[PDB]
Amino acid sequence: HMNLSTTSGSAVIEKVIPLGVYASSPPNQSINIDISACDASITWDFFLSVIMAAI
Amino acid sequence: VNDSFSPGNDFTHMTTTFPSGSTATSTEHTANNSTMMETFLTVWGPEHTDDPDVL
Amino acid sequence: QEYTQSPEIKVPIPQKDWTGPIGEIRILKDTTSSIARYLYRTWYLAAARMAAQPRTWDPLFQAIMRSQYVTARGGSGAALRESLYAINVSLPDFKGLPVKAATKIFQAAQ
Amino acid sequence: VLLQRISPLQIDPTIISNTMSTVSESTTQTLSPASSILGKLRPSNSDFS
Amino acid sequence: EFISSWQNHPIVQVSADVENKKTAQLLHADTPRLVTWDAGLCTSFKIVPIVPAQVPQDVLAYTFFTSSYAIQSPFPEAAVSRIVVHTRWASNVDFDRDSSVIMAPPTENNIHLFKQLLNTETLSVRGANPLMFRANVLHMLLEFVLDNLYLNRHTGFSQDHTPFTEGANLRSLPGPDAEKWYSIMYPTRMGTPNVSKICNFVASCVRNRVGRFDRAQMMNGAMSEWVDVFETSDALTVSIRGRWMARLARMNINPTEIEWALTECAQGYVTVTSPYAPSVNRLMPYRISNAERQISQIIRIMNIGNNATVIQPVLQDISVLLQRISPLQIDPTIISNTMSTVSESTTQTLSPASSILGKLRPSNSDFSSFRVALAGWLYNGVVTTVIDDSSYPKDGGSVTSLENLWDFFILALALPLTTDPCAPVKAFMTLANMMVGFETIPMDNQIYTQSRRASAFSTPHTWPRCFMNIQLISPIDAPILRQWAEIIHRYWPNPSQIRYGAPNVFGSANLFTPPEVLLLPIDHQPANVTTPTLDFTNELTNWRARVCELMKNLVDNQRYQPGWTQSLVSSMRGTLDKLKLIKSMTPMYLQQLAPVELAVIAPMLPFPPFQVPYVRLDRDRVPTMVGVTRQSRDTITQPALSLSTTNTTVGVPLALDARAITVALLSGKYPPDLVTNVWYADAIYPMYADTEVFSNLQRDMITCEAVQTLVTLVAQISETQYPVDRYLDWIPSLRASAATAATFAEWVNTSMKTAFDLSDMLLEPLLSGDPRMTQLAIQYQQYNGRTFNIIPEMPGSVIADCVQLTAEVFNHEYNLFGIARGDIIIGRVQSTHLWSPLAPPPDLVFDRDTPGVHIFGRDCRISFGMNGAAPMIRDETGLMVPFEGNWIFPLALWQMNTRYFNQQFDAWIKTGELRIRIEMGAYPYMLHYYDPRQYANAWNLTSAWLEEITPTSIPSVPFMVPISSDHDISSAPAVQYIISTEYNDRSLFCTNSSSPQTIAGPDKHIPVERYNILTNPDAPPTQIQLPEVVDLYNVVTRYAYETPPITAVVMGVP
Amino acid sequence: AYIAVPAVVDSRSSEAIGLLESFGVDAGADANDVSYQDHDYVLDQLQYMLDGYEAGDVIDALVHKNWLHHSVYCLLPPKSQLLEYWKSNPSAIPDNVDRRLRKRLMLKKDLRKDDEYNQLARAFKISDVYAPLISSTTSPMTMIQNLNQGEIVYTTTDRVIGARILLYAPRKYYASTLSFTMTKCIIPVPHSRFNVGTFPSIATPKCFVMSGVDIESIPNEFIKLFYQRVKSVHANILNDISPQIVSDMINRKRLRSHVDVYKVDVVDMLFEVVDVADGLRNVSRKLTMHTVPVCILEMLGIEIADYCIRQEDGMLTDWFLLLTMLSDGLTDRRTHCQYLINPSSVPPDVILNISITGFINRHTIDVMPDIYDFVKPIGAVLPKGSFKSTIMRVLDSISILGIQIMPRAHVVDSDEVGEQMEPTFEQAVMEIYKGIAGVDSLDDLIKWVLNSDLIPHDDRLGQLFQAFLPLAKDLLAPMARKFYDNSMSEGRLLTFAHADSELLNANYFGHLLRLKIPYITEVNLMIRKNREGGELFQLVLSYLYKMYATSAQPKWFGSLLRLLICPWLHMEKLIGEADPASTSAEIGWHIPRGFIPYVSIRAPRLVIEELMEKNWGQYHAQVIVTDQLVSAKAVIKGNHLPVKLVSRFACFTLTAKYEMRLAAYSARLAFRSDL
């Protein structure tokens, strides 16, 4: 209810080709962001504490 | 850890890495990704940068 | 090599920003200088909106959620066996069953 | 800095937070004036140069 | 490097945080503990020895004194005795208030008692800032009263079997030891063998005032209702407990009234019984005033402001109660069964029955929304129920769409049950939005046009003119719209009212409505039978029929029919007929039974109903603002003149789902064989065994008491608009501000919470504003501009009255509390005389009117001497004078120039001829006793005091006093340096009490005036001499009342 | 006379243990005057009820229960099952049943298709035969009322409260849960003058509730809730009596097996700070110190008197320091706030003379930390300047049964890891002035970062933390990993740390604890001399450690000490004079051809003889033996030993040193040691 989330499997058909082609087509531009070691970064010190208390 | 290829390399490890076999991992990963991106776009960036084009 | 890393929090939340424990968890103040306020608010509002739903309380919905994690794959039920044996409770052995015991289905049956 | 050091006035943003008393004025409708004004003011910031 | 400053990290004693337990407080609140019993002595003053006696001695043989024979004595046997304040030093309580005030003998330091509130910057441990003495004393007196708030208990008696009394009845104290109490309680019982002072005092008293002398024996073989006794006590605590008992007695009620109130509240569905026989004087304080109820209601409304999450769970709880006690229940298959018989053709692409079923989707949980909608009727003042925006069509819809027609039908049925006053306009604009393009009507402006969403018409200003005046709608161009407008005007439900509650005991909390009255947005018609059957003579049924016939007319219109197949038209007409003739019991239930359930539920709700009048279609009377006030403006003193501009609006909208309400309205059924009286007698019986309302009454009483106490105390240190008397203006105080007032109010709040054992919020709703100008009022406004306001009357406060009485007594008995009054004089006196420094001879004292004195003030300048000349200081007249003579100094001058003044003046004070009068007003003192037969000097103590004076605190003033003697003694020189300007020696009790007389030193016999009852033979037994003198022997009344629970006396028939 | 106390009470266990004596009641000589009720089944019924309803209404209903009147629930099967049970053994049908139904039931013929029996079956209702029926919808208040009035309360559900439940039919017909704890067999007590129970009641004015234990400090959480709700609702109509009053009531006219070792009695001590600088006295402050065990108080004789808590040198005395460590903190009596003692003699707020006044709250607690589930090493997190050396000395100076609990060789400080590095961590972090811009020395770095009041500017500290985090993250962590690994391989030890973050990053294995002390620690850092980089540098380092530590509540330090000491002296009181051979035992890993000890046990003969028959051999390990003065190392493959194998009974050593009597093998441990 609060973001542009996507879900897909290993099948290529399940992806969203329109989004990629719209992003790549000029004069539109795209920036690729990837979180490195997201599982390691997610810890009690910041996240788990805040989210568990909030929930 | 029970490594068949190495006889005797059998032990137990204490780690803080978030589990990967759970039934939510990707789901809250997406949630926190979106939340933190929104936080940067709405608060942190405008109060750390001054370039008018960037603003 | 994969399970030995840890996050590097350059700017941590100040310690004078958490209340006394409730249960075992703590409450983060609303005057905190950290950006964690917005994440806290988002999760709080999402939880409240989730709780205020009739479908959430549908017993069939609860049954679906409970049957979701049950799967014919392994679930490390061994450690469960030693734990329950330590607390001395006894589980059915299901001797004579021509099925493997390393399944969450078998765990649920136990 | 000299005026800040010699003045008796103390700037405590907790007054606004106490007066508003709003983590979330409402959790049903998307618009909340008290939450909006608190978020715009950002009382937690402590730089008053 | 010895920084000594990092250790000075202050800790704030009051913290503020976001507050979500206001919901918990509103749902349930802690009950104050009012009834507490005491079985000990009713005294707060005790006599302590200061200097031991002189036994044995070389003059009088040891066979004279009674201490040699080990005879117990009422008063201490010592050379010096003084009175000290110690609250509850002899008592046996069942609950502990924890507001005790203990002092030490004057030969010890008591400075810590006067540095409790605002001395957070005083570095020293033996000094205090003299500018908060008034605040500290006020807090101390409040603690005194709060600690002394108790009740006396009648324990038991025994007859005297010795000839010391004429067979009197003596009380027995419950405790580990009793020999000491039996001698302390009755001074007159002791024998008098010798001519000592104590024996003389005892022999000078009457013999027939001791023990019990009056009883109330109302039954045989049962405890006496009350007794009156002569025993050691003090008038201050006696009076305080008397006022407390009177306050509770004004609240006492009897079981018959409770029975009547419960029956009238239960509306005859529940019966309860009470006994009819002589009884044992129970104490059940539960009756308070309408003013207190209204004040508590206003405070609760102030707490719940603009925040939906604080009020929603209350509605949820009410819905749960309604579900538990209501007979109406959902029918599972009524709609499907009635719609499974409409004739249709299978070759059509549209099915009205399938479409309507898909749009409806009935569910059992849909009744929760219906019940919360019902519950919302009692709180339209603060909560406005609306239809959620998601129920409306996404783009406004079109009349060519069967789905949009069903959306219109659902919204039309759901809207008239909400409390939103713009519901008729929204209902009209829904059809207007759907029929845009097909039919046109004239709007007002280009903003709120016919294409605007129907949910945006939410204020009275937005009502279109064509809605109010039907003649503007063209009968030819917009026939359907004109018909719909006429139907809305002549078929909208009519509000009504009902009666509820039993205000004889519970009072009334209504604000903008007459007491005992609930308003309802629909008409109420009482049922006349207990076996109901289906009935269609209801306004809601008429509404449904009119909506169905309007849709039929729309379908049969000749500009719409040619676009449809004949089969579809027939199917739609059949579906509309079936919907019109469906057999639903909900409209009849809402007319005949729901108001009764609401009325029987209302009196036992934690949050009493808060309502404003319902208006049907009268726009001029629509409420537009509800506000409360808690402060005042610049110089405005009358609340009626500042309520208009010193108020904050309250109110919040809550959204509901139209589909659930429509499903509930369409599918309702009763049990197969229902008898209403039996059903309700069964259902209501368990609910009427609770006492939470009885607890809430006490909570409200305590709240009002706290508010009045707060304002009364704040008026003493600030300037307020209420009349009040002052008694502690001679005690120095600073120039207070808003922060000072807030801190003082916080301390008072904490003290009272601790005293009454409360953990939740109290006075914190009022602590968010400047407490120097407080007031309480509420108002609301209509569209046409008229305002109606309520200003509750303020009831009295027994606690505030007792605090003021304590201040009056303190104004004469300040010495007993460790405080001295006046100013001090510093100068060298050397002599062998034995006068006390606390009662100096008059010739030593000089004042402003004494000729020759020099008065110093703000502008002091010191000019050094040169070549043998003497240094000089500038007087206020303008002359420069040397360092000799009599000077008058305000304290602040020395305080601000401590080191310089010490260095320039100490030598001349010690050895020269300089005498200085320091003006102080009030100060704590210390005593040091010295033997009169040896040399003694006080320069060390005086110099220490002078040198530890600092610009932000002072230490206790030390005095050097001789010791009284009962035989001849030689004399030795003594050097004094500090004296007081007036008599400050009221703490003495007796000197050489075991000896026949006092030959040398200060002399003081036992004060007869403090024992007026025993020493004046022709005085009434119940005479007190407050506030000038506090008596130490009085008449005490002790009770034995019972405090049973409600259910122990009032029993309901199962 | 019913008296309610804030603890669970049972007929036999509360009689065996001195419950009233534990609360402080004087002895009653003969015990025929008092009788104890049992409320454990009531408590589990309360939990079951809470599973369905809300807490408040259930508590309010249970308040109105009369415990002096007997009654029981009778559970009936479902309607159909009742019909078959009546069809069998037809003597069970009551007279209230319809004549036609009774005659048809005697048909002794297959009645499925008679349809007259069938229409009667739809017509039948259980409420017709039995008037009082709970029917699983009845309110708890109505349940309590029907239980109070009458003797048999019929029910069709098991979610009830207040009394024992008896079956009406054989178990075959009932398809419900097998709650045999409350449900007895299908086929089938006077009160003394004083009856002691747990739950207070207001049914009759002869009921009493015992005060003297603060409602905050109630150990059992359900009882805490019940007492809170009762006191908050019915405050004005409760009879409160002191333990002294209870003792007087008990002794008015007359006066004129296996025992658990992990239960201790604690008290709250009241005292006042007094300045006696001159011959006069000056009372400065009123303090209350919480949760002080009574046995240590009796050992180190403390009475109501005046004491000095400083030695000639100027430091706190050992007994006072130990008492403060054992306690759970100090609170100011006037302002209800936590109080932190100043360790130094710097004039502001120095405590030198104290005066004891009395003890008020007395109750029994359990020293079991409740997380010590498996026997594992212990790692405690304690900040800098916490008298670590003094605590180590005091602990090493303790030996009760010739056991010498906590040898200094079995503990490791928080500084060995730093010292192992060739450039040790302290002088390693003393070059942050090179990295930071504008600062040329450690001295002016300290001057820059700290204020004139010795308080760190947040912005400057954050920059310094930015510089500090890498070094603490990439140098200390691997060395710490290696150190904890080889320490675990060598044996079980107690490990002190400055922050839990370093242990978490080093992947420490074992139980982890956060502890704090009621003192201003930084004052010690400022006052003590012999600093490597200076007292100011140590202060800044402590600030860095506190920032590095994560967000979690540090428990009070006395929680560990109670478990560490109290059971040993309690067991000494019992088996002080017993034969050591019979009362001593030991467990360890055995190798065939050797026995390397693991845990040392002290217990009575009975406890030892049941511990004899345990299958320790279910656990396995690998042992490597080296040749020093003789050294061995052990690695456990599998799970660890559950603590309750040793059980609540018997006292065991918490730390071990793998050292054979002064090659690789696979070992299975055994209970080799014995009489």
What is the per-residue DSSP string for E249-260?
A: HHHB--HHHHHH
Cβ neighbors of F139 (< 8 A, separation 6 or more) are E686, F57, F61
Determine the Cα–Cα distance for residues F104 and F115; give it in Å rounded to an integer. 11
Residue E952: helix, strand or coil by DSSP?
A: coil
Taken in order F180, F185, F186, F188, the sign of the CA dihedral is: negative
The alpha carbon of residue F175 and the mean position of all alpha carbons in its chain are separated, in whole angstroms, by 38
Q: Which of F254, F365, F362 has the alpha carbon at shortest distance from F20?
A: F362
Contact E414/E387 with Cβ under 8 angstroms?
A: yes
Determine the Cα–Cα distance for residues A10 and C45; give it in Å rounded to an integer. 33
Which residues on chain E are in Cβ contact (under 8 Å) with C19?
17
Beta bridge partners of E38: E93, E152
Residue E955 DSSP one-character state = E
Determine the Cα–Cα distance for residues F281 and F263; give it in Å rounded to an integer. 40
Q: What is the DSSP string of E667-681?
A: S-B--SS--HHHHHH
The alpha carbon of residue E873 and the mean position of all alpha carbons in its chain are separated, in whole angstroms, by 56
Contact E323/E367 with Cβ under 8 angstroms?
A: yes
Residue whose tokens read 């008053």: D48
Q: How far is C37 from chain A (nearest CA, A)?
A: 9
Contact F338/F329 with Cβ under 8 angstroms?
A: yes
Determine the Cα–Cα distance for residues E81 and E992; give it in Å rounded to an integer. 9
Chains that touch F (3 or more CB pairs under 8 A): A, B, C, E
Contact E1006/E201 with Cβ under 8 angstroms?
A: yes
Interchain contact C/B (3 or more Cβ pairs less than 8 Å): yes
Whether residues E1045 and F337 touch (CB distance < 8 A) is answered with: no
Angle at E826 between CA E822 and CA E827, to 5 degrees: 140
Please tell me if residue B35 touches chain C, with a CB cutoff of 8 Å.
Answer: yes
Determine the Cα–Cα distance for residues B43 and C33; give it in Å rounded to an integer. 12
Residue E965 DSSP one-character state = B
Residue E989: helix, strand or coil by DSSP?
A: strand
Q: How far is F581 from chain E (nearest CA, A)?
A: 49
Long-range contacts of E612-617 (CB under 8 A, 24+ apart): E612/E380, E612/E381, E612/E512, E612/E780, E613/E512, E613/E513, E613/E519, E614/E380, E614/E419, E614/E495, E614/E519, E614/E520, E614/E521, E615/E421, E615/E495, E616/E492, E616/E493, E616/E494, E616/E495, E617/E424, E617/E489, E617/E492
Q: What is the DSSP string of F551-620?
A: S-PPEETHHHHHHHHHHHHHHHHHHSSS-HHHHEEEEEEE----EEEEEEEE--HHHHHHHHS--GGG-E
The alpha carbon of residue F242 and the mean position of all alpha carbons in its chain are separated, in whole angstroms, by 26
Which residues on chain D are in Cβ contact (under 8 Å) with C44?
23-24
Determine the Cα–Cα distance for residues E457 and C26; give it in Å rounded to an integer. 45
Contact E202/E189 with Cβ under 8 angstroms?
A: no
In one-letter notation, the amino acid at residue F430 is M
Q: Mutation test of the interface with chain F: which of A45, A49, A51, choosing the one with the most F Cβ atoms within 10 A?
A: A45
Give me E237's structure tokens.
């605590």
Which strand (E) or helix (H) includes residue E312? helix E308-325
Please tell me if residue D29 touches chain C, with a CB cutoff of 8 Å.
Answer: no
Q: Which of B36, A44, D41, F461 has the alpha carbon at shortest distance from C36?
A: B36
Which string of b and e fits C51-69 if b means at least 16 CB within 10 Å? eeeeeeeeeeeeeeeeeee
Angle at E832 between CA E830 and CA E834, to 5 degrees: 110
Determine the Cα–Cα distance for residues E153 and E171; give it in Å rounded to an integer. 11
Give me F454's structure tokens.
């010795």
Which pairing describes strands F353-366 and F306-308: parallel, antiparallel, or unpaired?
A: antiparallel
Please tell me if residue A4 touches chain C, with a CB cutoff of 8 Å.
Answer: no
Contact E96/F360 with Cβ under 8 angstroms?
A: no
State phi, psi for F664 to the nearest 5 degrees. Answer: -110, 135
Determine the Cα–Cα distance for residues E1 and E30; give it in Å rounded to an integer. 52
Contact F73/F160 with Cβ under 8 angstroms?
A: yes
Which residues on chain F are in Cβ contact (under 8 Å) with B15?
507
Which residues on chain C are in Cβ contact (under 8 Å) with A54?
39-40, 42-44, 47
Q: Count other Cβ atoms within 10 Å, centred on residue F89.
A: 10
Determine the Cα–Cα distance for residues E714 and E134; give it in Å rounded to an integer. 12
Q: Which of E888, E895, E938, E859 has the alpha carbon at shortest distance from E732?
A: E895
Give me E138's structure tokens.
């006020």
Chain A 22-41, residues with CB within 8 Å of chain B CB atoms: 35, 38-40
Whether residues B44 and C5 touch (CB distance < 8 A) is answered with: no
Q: What is the DSSP string of E876-917?
A: SSS-EE-S-EEEEEEHHHHHHTHHHHHHHHHHHHHTSSEEEE
Beta bridge partners of F288: F270, F331
Which strand (E) or helix (H) includes residue F524? helix F521-527
Determine the Cα–Cα distance for residues F481 and F477; give it in Å rounded to an integer. 6
Whether residues E13 and F280 touch (CB distance < 8 A) is answered with: no
The verdict on whether omega for the bond into residue E56 sits within 30 degrees of 0, i.e. cis, is yes
Contact F583/F611 with Cβ under 8 angstroms?
A: no
E306 to chain D: closest CA residue:
D25
Which pairing describes strands E226-232 and E1033-1039: parallel, antiparallel, or unpaired?
A: antiparallel
Give me F648's structure tokens.
């609540």
Please report, to the nearest 10 degrees, the dihedral formed by the alpha carbons of residues E240, E241, E242, E245 taken in order. 130
Chains that touch C (3 or more CB pairs under 8 A): A, B, D, E, F
Which residues on chain F are in Cβ contact (under 8 Å) with E7?
342, 346, 348-349, 520, 523
Please tell me if residue B41 touches chain A, with a CB cutoff of 8 Å.
Answer: no
CA-based Rg of chain F, rounded to a whole angstrom?
33
Give me F620's structure tokens.
């396995």
Q: Count other Cβ atoms within 10 Å, centred on residue E185.
A: 24
Beta bridge partners of E80: E51, E991
Chains that touch B (3 or more CB pairs under 8 A): A, C, F
Which strand (E) or helix (H) includes residue E574? helix E566-580
Number of H helices, E strands in chain C: 4, 0
Determine the Cα–Cα distance for residues E1042 and E315; give it in Å rounded to an integer. 39
Q: How far is F459 from chain B (nearest CA, A)?
A: 15
CA-based Rg of chain E, rounded to a whole angstrom?
41
Taken in order E422, E427, E428, E430, the sign of the CA dihedral is: positive
Long-range contacts of E736-739 (CB under 8 A, 24+ apart): E738/E770, E738/E772
Resolution of the PDB structure in angstroms = 3.0
The residues of D whose Cβ lies within 8 A of any Cβ of E are 14, 17-19, 21-29, 34
Q: How far is E703 from chain D (nearest CA, A)?
A: 22
Determine the Cα–Cα distance for residues E216 and E203; give it in Å rounded to an integer. 32
Residue whose tokens read 């913290």: E15
Q: What is the DSSP string of E106-131?
A: TTSB-GGGGSSSS-SS---SSEE-TT
Please tell me if residue F527 touches chain E, with a CB cutoff of 8 Å.
Answer: no
Which pairing describes strands F72-75 and F152-155: parallel, antiparallel, or unpaired?
A: parallel
Ramachandran region, residue C88 (left: φ > 0; alpha: ψ -120 to 50; beta: rest): left
Determine the Cα–Cα distance for residues E1000 and E734; give it in Å rounded to an integer. 44
Contact F52/F145 with Cβ under 8 angstroms?
A: no
Give me F266's structure tokens.
């604690």
Q: How far is C31 from chain D (nearest CA, A)?
A: 5
Which pairing describes strands F2-4 and F207-210: parallel, antiparallel, or unpaired?
A: parallel
Give me E635's structure tokens.
């110089």
Contact E955/E126 with Cβ under 8 angstroms?
A: yes
Number of H helices, E strands in chain A: 3, 0
* Residue E437 burial by Cβ neighbours in a 10 Å radius (0-12, 13-18, 19+): exposed
Please tell me if residue F508 touches chain B, with a CB cutoff of 8 Å.
Answer: yes
* Residue E698 burial by Cβ neighbours in a 10 Å radius (0-12, 13-18, 19+): buried
Cβ neighbors of F421 (< 8 A, separation 6 or more) are F428, F475, F476, F479
Alpha helices of F264-420 — where are they, by DSSP H?
294-299, 318-326, 388-396, 416-420
Q: Count other Cβ atoms within 10 Å, centred on residue E865.
A: 11
Taken in order E38, E44, E50, E56, the sign of the CA dihedral is: negative
Determine the Cα–Cα distance for residues E922 and E137; give it in Å rounded to an integer. 11
Cβ neighbors of F118 (< 8 A, separation 6 or more) are F111, F112
Which strand (E) or helix (H) includes residue E922? strand E914-930
Determine the Cα–Cα distance for residues E612 and E595; give it in Å rounded to an integer. 17
The verdict on whether omega for the bond into residue E464 sits within 30 degrees of 0, i.e. cis, is no
In one-letter notation, the amino acid at residue F647 is S
Give me D13's structure tokens.
């943003």
Contact C62/C53 with Cβ under 8 angstroms?
A: no
Taken in order E536, E538, E542, E544, the sign of the CA dihedral is: negative
Distances (CA, A) of E315 to D26, E159, E374, F645: 15, 64, 9, 53
Which residues on chain D are in Cβ contact (under 8 Å) with C33?
44-46
Q: Count other Cβ atoms within 10 Å, centred on residue C77.
A: 17
Query: N- to C-terminal Cα distance for chain B?
Result: 51
Q: Which of E552, E582, E548 has the alpha carbon at shortest distance from E570?
A: E552
Q: Which of E33, E44, E87, E247 has the alpha carbon at shortest distance from E802?
A: E247
Angle at C15 between CA C9 and CA C19, to 5 degrees: 130
Q: Residue B14 is nearest to which of F508, F635, F637, comparing CB atoms?
A: F508
Which strand (E) or helix (H) includes residue E625? strand E623-629
Whether residues D44 and C31 touch (CB distance < 8 A) is answered with: yes
Distances (CA, A) of E737 to E49, E593, E718, E734, E774: 44, 58, 8, 9, 15
Residue A46 DSSP one-character state = I
* Residue A40 burial by Cβ neighbours in a 10 Å radius (0-12, 13-18, 19+): middle
Residue F10: helix, strand or coil by DSSP?
A: coil
Give me E757's structure tokens.
């054992």
Interchain contact D/A (3 or more Cβ pairs less than 8 Å): no
Determine the Cα–Cα distance for residues E665 and E684; give it in Å rounded to an integer. 25
Q: Count other Cβ atoms within 10 Å, centred on residue E796.
A: 11
Whether residues C29 and E365 touch (CB distance < 8 A) is answered with: no
Distances (CA, A) of E574 to E67, E338, E568, F533: 114, 11, 10, 96
Residue whose tokens read 């709060």: E146
C48 to chain D: closest CA residue:
D27
Q: What is the DSSP string of E496-547?
A: EEEE---HHHH----SSS-TTEEEESS-------SS------SHHHHHHHHH
Which strand (E) or helix (H) includes residue E920? strand E914-930
Cβ neighbors of F506 (< 8 A, separation 6 or more) are F477, F480, F481, F484
Number of H helices, E strands in chain E: 31, 32
CA atoms within a 13 Å half-sphere pointing along the CA-CB vector of F580: 5
Distances (CA, A) of E1033 to E152, E654, E1022, F408: 16, 65, 10, 68
CA-based max dimension of chain C = 63
Q: How far is F231 from chain E (nearest CA, A)?
A: 9
Q: Which of E395, E545, E556, E400 has the alpha carbon at shortest distance from E480?
A: E556
Which residues on chain A are in Cβ contact (under 8 Å) with F550?
44-45
* Residue E381 burial by Cβ neighbours in a 10 Å radius (0-12, 13-18, 19+): buried
Which residues on chain B are in Cβ contact (under 8 Å) with F635?
11
In one-letter notation, the amino acid at residue F585 is A
Q: Residue A54 is nearest to which of C9, C40, C49, comparing CB atoms?
A: C40
Which residues on chain B are in Cβ contact (under 8 Å) with F637?
10-11
Residue whose tokens read 């309010």: F60
Determine the Cα–Cα distance for residues E1041 and E227; give it in Å rounded to an integer. 12
Residue whose tokens read 């003082």: E744
Beta bridge partners of E229: E212, E1036
Contact E860/E897 with Cβ under 8 angstroms?
A: yes
CB contacts < 8 A, C to E, total: 10
Q: Which of E850, E876, E848 has the alpha carbon at shortest distance from E861?
A: E876
Q: How far is A45 from chain F (nearest CA, A)?
A: 6
Contact E117/E13 with Cβ under 8 angstroms?
A: no
Q: Residue D23 is nearest to which of E18, E653, E654, comparing CB atoms?
A: E18
Which residues on chain D are in Cβ contact (under 8 Å) with C32?
44
Determine the Cα–Cα distance for residues E483 and E470; give it in Å rounded to an integer. 10
Interchain contact A/C (3 or more Cβ pairs less than 8 Å): yes
Determine the Cα–Cα distance for residues C67 and F128; give it in Å rounded to an integer. 42
